[PDB]
Amino acid sequence: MTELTYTEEVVSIEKLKEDDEFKTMVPSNNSREDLEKSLREKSQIFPLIADRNYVLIDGYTRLDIMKKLGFKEVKILKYDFDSQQERDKAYELIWTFNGVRRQLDKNERLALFQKIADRIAKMQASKNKTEQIEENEEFVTLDDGTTISALEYERILKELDKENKALSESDKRKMAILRINTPWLLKYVTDQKYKVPLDQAFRIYTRVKDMGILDKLKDLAPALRDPLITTREGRKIILNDEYRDLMEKIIS
């Protein structure tokens, strides 16, 4: 992978062009007032991240705040690549500057992590097709035709977080297995509405797959599946064995 280079410069605040995808990459959080006073008191401590053509990659909230605070010019890091052609590079920057961020809870960074890894996967299926064994058996098909195994996806995760500063070894493997084998289940961990813990979601996975009822659970009606999963009360029914009879009933 080519090395990323950039230069530090100051530009008119209106010179920055926004990319609606990058604008919505990072899950909404409660950090606005945080970097609102930072910019209020001591102005710009950190520069924003832009590409060669001044397309904003990272710093959409910060830019919005500064626009409203009268700021006329903003310090940036202009990287020497075209985000519209080398998206993969923009994707990496957004992860680098957000995955470790503390203002983001574990579930919001996981949702970002997946959003990133999914992008990188398509970026590699468009190059390879143009220019543990068990884990390599299962595959998922993204909304573009890009298919991939739990193994490849997991290796992609590691590449994005080698020093495990964002997640742990087992967390990346748990997430990878869920992402490929049971996407509908991962969404519960990713959904802002639920923020179901990963490790808890994975316990449900291994559990329901031992009972041979992975598909019954997946095919359950939302009215029944949501409460059974997004609630601690519901998980007991799935996890604690003294509730087998109830579970079998819920299933059908």
**Rounded Cα gap, residues 209 and 90, in angstroms:** 38
In 3D space, the residue among 88, 77, 95, 122 whose CA is nearest the CA of residue 26 turns out to be 95
**Rounded Cα gap, residues 34 and 97, in angstroms:** 16
Between CA 157 and CA 161, with CA 160 as vertex, the angle to 5 degrees is: 90
Please state whether beta strands 55-58 and 139-141 pair in parallel, antiparallel, or not at all (unpaired): unpaired
Exposed e or buried b for every residue in 230-245, given b needs 16+ CB within 10 A? beeebbebbeeeeeee
Under a CB-based contact definition with an 8 Å cutoff, are residues 6 and 69 in contact? no
Q: What is the chain's percent helix, strand, coil content, to nearest 5?
A: 55, 10, 35
> Would you kindly state where each structural domain of the chain is located, as residue ranges?
2-132, 133-252
Between CA 133 and CA 225, with CA 166 as vertex, the angle to 5 degrees is: 70
**Rounded Cα gap, residues 202 and 205, in angstroms:** 5
What is the token pair recorded at 241?
């064995």
Q: How many other C-beta atoms can be found within 10 angstroms of the C-beta atom of residue 54?
A: 14
The sheet with strand 48-50 has its strands ordered as: 6-12, 73-79, 48-50, 55-58, 17-18
**Rounded Cα gap, residues 8 and 181, in angstroms:** 44
Can you give the resolution of this entry in Å?
Answer: 2.5
Under a CB-based contact definition with an 8 Å cutoff, are residues 151 and 135 in contact? yes
**Rounded Cα gap, residues 117 and 86, in angstroms:** 15
What is the token pair recorded at 173?
């493997």
Solved how? X-ray
